[PDB]
């Protein structure tokens, strides 16, 4: 059973450059030289559920799909969306999809989009013949317990939202394969407390520093690098292609050094084939870095018929997910 | 394709009585007489991921399953688990399942278990022939920003965890059907009057529901909820291939007797003896574990034997209305 991507959409607010951040004293001058970043998309007071609604509407309106025809809604995120005891997917269920679908919030850090693609693809295959599913990501890091500039090491957090409409019937693109491996031994990399949940602020740099200070074996990082290449080898094998067939690579919007060494230099591909130039100005958009990169490559016409995109992403777990999207025809909105 | 329940497991800490709560001044005497609840399961400083790890291991060890053969892990929850920027399923991934599965956190209030059963059933059907999936729920409502006694109207929150092991191959029970309808017009019931800022304030569903009734009393939202409550039960029974007469027991949430009787049992036209209220009232509302822990208790004690059916009914944020039917084929391999 084939799973086709009918359409994709996003919402990106106004970008704040690093030169501005350096002047006010939010971002460091040395870090601006160390990480050659462009900027970060800042929403401000716009809720993340609203940003997801804008991205979902564009994806639906692009291909001319009916919101009621959807059989699944997967809202993914890595940070608080709204009030506690209330999930964000009901907002899209009210103002778009309708209450005759399976709406459910996914959470797996920045790799939540990859897991949603697996669950959505499995849901469509098991379901009826004419099926369709909506997968969306959205986050607003402009909050009290999150500093977009200094929280994450090697990247600047950004606000926005990504969307994608999967379907059983033929479309412009096709999801060939998508995997998700993990190194659970390095699960302490993204924490350092578990008795009391909320209260303290977020800072991945200190949590990574605390994890690096003490390890039982400490061959986690190397097994993480092994499992980075393993999941890519597995995804390409399932998709039925080689690394030579890959046209572009969609890694997260981390520092130029990190994107070069960990992703592109590991696979043995040039930095021109990455989505770094575009991604640098946007920053790390939670779990929307590869779908917004796919959107930009598809919409502009850089990724034409016959080409393959290699979506890769490492997140908390540490979980390493890889996906392969093939463009069959040109997009109906380009 | 048939989706069988291989086994089920749970964890329930020491139950604090309602009479104790009235003496200390946490729970009012009026609500004690009105709701007629027994008590609530209270964990001290035990994390919810640990509580899920107990329930997961129990369900796995009961049927003699090996954790690595699982092809899916669905961790569901209604409230915070641990540190932010870190999901709880990785804890079970290290100390049980392993990093060769699709681990992912589900969130849909108290009906998150029902949605996980749909996604797990669909994942097993679409996947290979021999398959198995672990679905688990776990929550700890022990403050700061959550008063277990006064937060929820008509129910006392309780700590614990519920587990269930789905599979393609034959088992002791069978998941006949499971669905989830929603009335998105009443999504502001649990939101109330505050969206821009995410955190800082405490959770209090009574004031959130109270604020919604002012907005409602200024479209027929509540009648739609009551309509779609009976609709999802009708369609789940129709999908399962049975009638309401075939239902032996019913598993509703552990809310007050007045709520459990009127909204669920009186609505379906069944007696309160057929509910799981006598057992559930002691434990309280276990986030999204009320129906599976009720499934567990009925299975191991021998009250729900071969040929019987269990009608799991839920109502959560959305407002989402989920219903499921579980048929016991043979006696459990662990009782």
Author numbering:
A (entry chain A): 4 to 196, 202 to 224, 229 to 346
B (entry chain B): 4 to 197, 202 to 225, 230 to 346
The article reads:
Chlorothricin (CHL) belongs to a spirotetronate antibiotic family produced by Streptomyces antibioticus that inhibits pyruvate carboxylase and malate dehydrogenase. A previous study reported that ChlB3 is involved in the conversion of 6-methylsalicyl-S-ChlB1-ACP to 6-methylsalicyl-S-ChlB2 with catalytic efficiency kcat/Km = 1690.70 mM−1 min−1. ChlB3 is a dimer having the same active sites as CerJ (a structural homologous enzyme) and uses a KSIII-like fold to work as an acyltransferase.
ChlB3 structure is organized as a homodimer and each monomer having its own active site. The core region features an internal duplication of two segments (14–183 and 184–339) that are comparable in structure except at their loop regions, although there is no major sequence similarity between the two halves. Generally, in KSIII enzymes cystine is responsible for the transacylation process, although histidine and aspartic acid catalytic residues crucial for Claisen-like condensation. The volume of active site cavity, as calculated by the program CASTp 3.0, was 934 Å3.
